[PDB]
Amino acid sequence: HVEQTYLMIKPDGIQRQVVGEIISRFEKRGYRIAAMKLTIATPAILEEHYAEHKGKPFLPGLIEKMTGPVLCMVFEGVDVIAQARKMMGSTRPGEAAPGTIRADFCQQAGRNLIHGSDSAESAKREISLWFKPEEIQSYKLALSDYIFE
Amino acid sequence: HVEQTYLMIKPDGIQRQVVGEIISRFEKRGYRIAAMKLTIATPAILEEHYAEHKGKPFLPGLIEKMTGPVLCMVFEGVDVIAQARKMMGSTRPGEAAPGTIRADFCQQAGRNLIHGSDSAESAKREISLWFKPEEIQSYKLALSDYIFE
Amino acid sequence: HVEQTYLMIKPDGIQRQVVGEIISRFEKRGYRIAAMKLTIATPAILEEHYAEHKGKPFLPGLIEKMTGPVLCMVFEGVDVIAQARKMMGSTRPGEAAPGTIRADFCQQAGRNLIHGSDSAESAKREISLWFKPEEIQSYKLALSDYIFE
8 A cells, every 4th residue: 555745845955956856865765746846934833843842942943944946746646655755764854874964975964955844643733724625636547556565 | 995885776766756866876986887888677587586585475466566667787896785775765754764766756665766785705606697797897997086085 | 153174175086087977066156166186195184084994904905006196185165074074964975865976976885076175173173184274265255146045
């Protein structure tokens, strides 16, 4: 069975102009783009996105860093929630494995290029926060017979 | 002291049209192409290739997935049997390390893009199974002084 | 807080014509080129570079391998001394992690493409040996706000 995860390119990904490179890494595994939207993230939506951090001292600066253009994405694949986390690498780029997005592109946790859901529950919640159901597109990849066992 | 390993691009590698990208990963380390042949794998040769799995319940479906176009290859280099295995990553792509072929391209073990010999004995056996001696080409890389210590 | 490390493309990196690829890996993380110079390494400078190995049996052959064109470089970034070591990978390419320079390009320690300082003390010593302090250029990256937290 496949699942869907929420992935978001943060303002540093937009501004450093590496959006296509990020997308290509997920396409390369045969993950399917189920939704994609450019928007500008605002404090009110970011407060909900980061609801688990309410009241924490670092949240105001996090919301400031994230106030900017973002690319909202949903990718579908086998185990894609956990696998996308592995591909992004550790929160701290300096601790992330070579070959991961954060290790390959970044230096510090506050500018770490990309967000991905950390669990099935957060993926469901984040997809619903940033996308309406009518924005989620269902189609079958033509190479499915060679991607899935 | 170099050795030779048998590497085979499976039908999913052919059909997803990533043959050149796969070859480039091995060329990048200065490994030498000693043999290369496109063929369509038959159940008869696949039964011998997968002789270790004789009588197992998954073997019939494994042979079915592999009955298709394959690129047979021999690469030469220092420790290339073990090193190519490390480059491919774990059999299951989800367990493979970022930066490996299987982690970068694949989702499931039944469609994991590439085969490589797992030992000196299996390399000798697999090369002999898929290639005649006259198909193995001996030449020296012009960059040898800068590849080998 | 940023630091600077000494990175040097060895004659195999020059001769295999992968200089640009190497530079791009460090640029990709937002590391700043603070100095860059092509020279031809000579025994007298290499004896100082490898002073800690004076008298060891491998040193004469090492100096022979390293007598050739090199690209001297200083890169600046957060934790860049340790991070560049991680990006190069283990001295022995066969032990290096997939996704590192030495694992992706090399086979043996004597031809492992690149040198990087192993410590703050070594970076100061190596930068002073291979560059005049005047060749170190001060400027600020325009994308700093999206690279640094």
